[PDB]
């Protein structure tokens, strides 16, 4: 298990090939745009060594101690342990960090347990898993193709190499060219180029699955406009520390060593990789715990805002808070059933129930925009009446302590709270979180179509056919 210091030194020594506003980022650990999130990830690693949480965040195996997200669960009790680790980490950042490495460790863990799925590349998968686990490395991933012409398949874009495709194969590995649309949290040692959108037949050239060090020659991470509001924790409680960053990933004829290839030219293997291995189940397990943590944060802020300005006496405000409570319980329920109904898949890997997890990941994207709206409706103008800590420390401070106090709440505490509520909803950082919740697991339109097609609807149709027998009997 890594310490924060080890993670920081690794990024400083071998930084990912990041670019920000036309310039290469030489040291993300000190760069104004990245130092905050780096410090945050470091804190997650340090927590693994805190006496109070060591048993929750790590497990011992043959003299070594590994992060819980690497544990291949054999019992429901093991699943619960993984869930508690997901939750503890999520709580540290109010569920605002959506791409912490444990999400991808769940994927790799499942891939390894179900390694036979990958055939000749099975050992590569098992070895890669052990590598990430032993070194406790941080990962990032990019699964979607560039949004160019969505009316056409990967092979029908303006260029054959817009999506990541194989240029050639050599004795050392494969050379790839193209790009992936989005990679969140590029402050990692490794990047996973795994499957994502159901590949249409005839996409062999793009049917790939591999992993590479983020410093690989030819690999570039082009970062989008930064959303770090500033470094003041008072003024920017969340964006100053949890801005994970999103980036376009470019592959300029990058060489991928054979040992890092997991899938090559197999459309079907790519399309069923997450489902067959159980990676989908485990990554969705991290997600449900994460969204439960996120909803708990919104509930706390909503309750404090309402109490703070005396709006809690109004029935409709109480109802809005109760709505968040209902959603919180819904997510807790999905989480509980996902673990309780867990069963082993074809490779003997225990996986949390897909019915419950598909429910959770397809419902939350609909609930989040409403939870966000609720905070807006409760806070109203208080959400934009945001003087800075500098204003409180300035000449008008005394006036602000009088006009911005709440009901039995001092002004500084009030503004600190509303600055947080604002950062969770209306700052560039907060607003991005909404788009993220709507799309990170996929496009709802296609996710729902996928659920329709994979779900076993037969039992229900059969019960209706049985019920209708009495109807058709009138013709006998």
């Amino acid at each position: 298990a890594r310490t924060g210091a080890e993670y920081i030194e690794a990024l400083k020594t071998r930084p990912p090939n990041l670019w920000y506003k036309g310039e290469k980022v030489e040291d993300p650990t000190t760069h104004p745009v990245f130092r905050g999130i780096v410090r945050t990830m470091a804190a997650l690693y340090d927590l693994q060594h805190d006496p109070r949480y060591r048993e929750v965040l790590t497990y011992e195996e043959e003299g070594k101690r590994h992060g819980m997200s690497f544990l291949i669960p054999k019992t429901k009790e093991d699943l619960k342990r993984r869930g508690q680790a997901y939750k503890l980490w999520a709580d540290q950042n109010l569920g605002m960090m959506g791409r912490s490495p444990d999400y991808l460790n769940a994927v790799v863990m499942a891939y390894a347990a179900s390694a036979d799925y990958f055939g000749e590349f099975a050992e590569n998968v098992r070895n890669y898993y052990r590598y990430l686990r032993d070194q406790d490395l941080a990962t990032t991933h990019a699964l979607t193709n560039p949004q160019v012409n969505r009316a056409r398949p990967p092979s029908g874009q303006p260029d054959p190499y817009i999506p990541v495709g194989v240029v050639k194969q050599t004795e050392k590995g494969i050379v790839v060219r193209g790009a992936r649309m989005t990679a969140t949290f590029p402050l990692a040692d490794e990047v996973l180029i795994f499957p994502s959108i159901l590949l249409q037949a005839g996409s062999e050239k793009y049917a790939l699955a591999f992993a590479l060090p983020t410093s690989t020659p030819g690999l570039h991470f082009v970062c989008r406009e930064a959303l770090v509001g500033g470094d003041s924790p008072f003024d920017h409680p969340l964006s100053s520390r949890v801005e994970e960053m999103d980036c376009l990933v470019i592959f300029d004829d990058v060489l991928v060593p054979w040992e890092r290839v997991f899938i090559l030219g197999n459309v079907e293997l790519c399309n069923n990789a997450y489902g067959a291995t159980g990676a989908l189940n485990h990554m969705a397990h991290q997600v449900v715990a994460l969204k439960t943590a996120k909803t708990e944060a919104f509930l706390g802020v909503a309750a404090l805002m309402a109490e703070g300005i005396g709006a809690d006496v109004y029935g409709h405000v109480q109802e809005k808070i109760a709505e968040i409570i209902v959603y919180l319980e819904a997510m807790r329920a999905f989480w509980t059933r996902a673990e309780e109904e867990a069963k082993e898949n074809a490779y003997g890997l225990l996986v949390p129930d897909r019915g419950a997890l598909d429910g959770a990941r397809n419902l939350y994207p609909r609930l989040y925009p409403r939870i966000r709206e609720i905070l807006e409706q409760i806070g109203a103008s208080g959400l934009i009446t945001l003087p800075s800590e500098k204003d409180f420390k300035g000449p008008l401070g005394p006036f602000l302590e009088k006009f911005l106090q709440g009901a039995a709440l001092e002004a500084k505490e009030r503004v600190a709270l509303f600055r947080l509520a604002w950062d969770m909803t209306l700052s560039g950082f907060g607003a991005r979180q909404e788009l993220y919740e709507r799309f990170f697991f996929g496009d709802p339109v296609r996710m729902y179509q996928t659920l329709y097609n994979v779900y076993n609807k037969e039992p229900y149709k059969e019960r209706i056919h049985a019920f209708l027998k009495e109807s058709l009997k009138v013709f006998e």
Copy 2:
């Protein structure tokens, strides 16, 4: 455990004091408006003796066999058993029967287990429970006051005796006068006059809880417009058999024997009766199983309609069906967590988790109108293109078999299916189900306000206060 024949004979011998369109109903077992639901309840009782289900629907105790809804659960396994019985009964009628007796047996069972709550009337409660259980009697209940002037409390209506109040107390019992707004499924042996809406202080005269035989002199059940469409199972698949009926309950100076009094003149005892005894938890447990069954029925019909007319090839139709699947899984999740997180209350009675059940009963009333809308959007004009079995048996039958066939679906089967979908949504029977789901457990406005006030919001507020410490530290 009662047989259907015993239930039918009991109603025939001592029928409830029902009134329909100005006339007394002498025999509900043969009356056109009630014979259907009576036959349906009888079938539920008969199922308890079917070899295939006897172990699911009943339990043995000291030489006797009782209905599962009377079982005082001591373990989570016992809770699961109660849940399976709720579900099996619910499935028989596609979750369309909302007031089957097991819902109220759950209430009485909890009242009995937590009998100490009722003080001097504790033995009355325990004895009443044993009575209902031993005779396996059917019950109905009326908890709300007449909707007259909602701007005023029970003691501020046009008359002091509009709501049910105590006129006087004698050596034999109490005399009550007034009325209860609604009682669903009056085809029962007993009626429960228990608490409902939080009684405002100073309502001692109305703070009552008692039970009476439905044939009690002075007791009247005034039934509303019947929604039985007809007796043909083809033409009216549901209304011909599951029309439970709703009625206003009048008390014309009715005498309530002391042995049937459970609460008298105690406002606080009335207000906390369901929560303290665990009746709320257990009755909500029956509800979540019931709504899961109901959602399964809608899923089956939606899938069959879409497949039947070839609408399933359209993405948005698949998405609508997937939405029902998400809601189905949400209800299953609440059900699972309610049982898994169960704990004993103050009286030692194991009760399903209130967090999960409050989530389920406050979310479903919002989901149901949408599930209903989905069926409407899928079926479109097919939902009103409803010829009768008589049309198929008539001269134009051959034409109908050609014009109303579906995709690989014969016309008679198609119409039988759409007649069912229509009866579940647009017939008077179907539309009532929507209003029922929106309000049976209470007014959402007040249910949400109640949830806000009872829920422990402190842990979440505390986590936010802890997170904000760093914000306030900038002033040190």
Copy 3:
């Protein structure tokens, strides 16, 4: 202009070929299922002769007086006159009659004014218009194909003649075979078999437009389950008089005289018929006036229910009523702009603005379900606490007058009001109205796709391109 007596005698003398539950309807003017709506239509015709409304409902021309819906408008003032007639008729039935003949007269009027559109069949159209106008006949229409396999076009159904197609052409006319899915209000003298869903190319055999007397040999109207609750105006205020009925229309090798053919074998002419002639504009004009009347009815009932039970003192109830007011004003606005922005089409016919009307007909289907929901949320249990006038006239009458009174509202008036609210929302009649509003003008999915494709989006895209010039200038 026809009188009610003339309409009644016409239906009695030459009744439409209606079928109800396997039997031919010999006299719809006395049949229990149809006499109510017949009486209602008759009343609309009689209103044309009422001194108070003669100037609003009719116009004089060359010694004759015709119904306003036949007026070919030459000025905006004329458009306003047509609108006032639509509104006055709509108000008589609280906007619950959706297929009153003036809707189709608007279509025929536009077809006639733009008769050149039909080429060689132009005179047939002009003559047919004069016929309907002079005799002031009632019409019904059926535009959609049988819902069999929606995954395939009209020519790809289980049989080539499921949709109405031409079997052969003779010296006397064309012989057609097939069926139309739905025709509402079949209590008419004539049936219009006009285009509806955009016909896919290669559907020449189905590209038809003609009209026939409803008594034509081989023509059959198969009625669906009746929704007439009863004849008591107290018990069934709306269904006893406004149940228009829906039916499947069968064509058993029906002969269509050449003089009644308006379009034959021309796919493109069918697809653009409503838009090019202005029929779409005028029929949508009747619709916006109708929905304004309907919303006014719901506003009145909602306000009376809330006031009646004292629920109007609650803020959220006031907000719900205000929501209906907002929707009412939205419809009034669309109506006003539709008339004020009217311009002449390619044939010189003044047509109300399509932008405003497309807005109204695509927005109301979304607003209506909410308006209906609002009534449900306001009335709650009062909507199913529906004793009959027979109960008030019976032994328990005195009790009902006490328990069902409202706030300063007598019991009989209260129940009459709630019986109406119920009939507008939850009776079979009321629930059907919801499905009707969602689909009568077409499937929202396709209506919205149609709006996207016909709307001129260029001005807005051009303004954005102009705004972005400054953005691209940074590269100069």
Copy 4:
């Protein structure tokens, strides 16, 4: 009519008492946070002198030329002229500037026309109007009290002088102390301290209406966190120029000259000021034109995004764009009816219809969040894949031109478009716009309650009572 240069010189010479992060802003025309919006307002003033728009934006009167927003309309034609000026100005900034001065000029214009309303202060009002008009000054306003304890009235806060109240009256004027919660666009010469939230009786001390130069001693504007993303028009197309800023307004014993007092100690006069004068009608007229412009901007961007990435071929995307079209038409309809149904008020001032305007201002706050959501659903990940113009100008430029091109759309144009869509929805600037639309005209909860209480619901209730006469007749 002012020129941009004159406005800039005025702010430079006598700047408003603005504060940003603890420091006084000495020159808002050059300050990084304010120079953008100042330049934008200046451009609006300069447009008044453009030959192409002079006739639209100004009118001549007795040798002078004034801004159209000052025109006291005498005819509907005059109302139309005011509307066209509102629209032309709104279009310049895509409807993103919500507090341009013409909104408040409408208020002052109405106050002046209805000056008799103010009694002894009538001449002050008339004179103030002429002052603003003649000098064509810019105004800002603050109408709400500090959000401290919303459970109590203005006189029940932690201090009597939290809200703005009169300390004393002297021969020179009144001295006020307290604060107003929010003032948007403080880059003005004058600030209007007018009424807002219905004052509870007994608030005489707070019942005020006056205006002051923004440089008045003791007056302070405390600005919130700035949302200007940067100065690059490519990177921040909107926030670089339309960030109006919001601020808390402090009154440290400010002296208000008697000539600038319009209402003093009159609760009722304050509560009915906007309605009685017609200010509400005219300010809402500017708003409907503004929101129409805003919706046109969103329609253009949505259409361009969809076309740009080839998403327009998908039905659901077309439907989403059509939804925006429906909302656009709804706003156009409200605007048209507001002008067409205009009538003179009690003071002879022609005012646009309140029914239509109340519909528009209570509906748009519900429509805007959906319009914003639609852009999010169309753009998806493209909304956060935002490289900078600096990235295009850097080493990776060539790669970006390949991977970020769209369907027949070059990469630079594509990113410029998505940067705009992002700035309109997800940047701090964009997200604030959502909160602004939800609340600028007031709290929807109270706005809807206000509409319920002011609307004449009698005609509709009367029509229902008339319809129910037939129901009650069954008892005769």
